[PDB]
Amino acid sequence: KLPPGWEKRMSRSSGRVYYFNHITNASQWERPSGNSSSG
């Protein structure tokens, strides 16, 4: 699942918007990335 202290946000007119960090207080249009490879 996604990280502790988030939410997923959605839409204004055409159906766009994705993610917002709640403990920080930051809006975005992507996930926190979260996929390891060397680290």
Partner: peptide, 13 residues
Amino acid sequence: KVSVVRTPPKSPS
């Protein structure tokens, strides 16, 4: 503080 939700760049129009 009141706010709109902020996308990091913008929508491409």
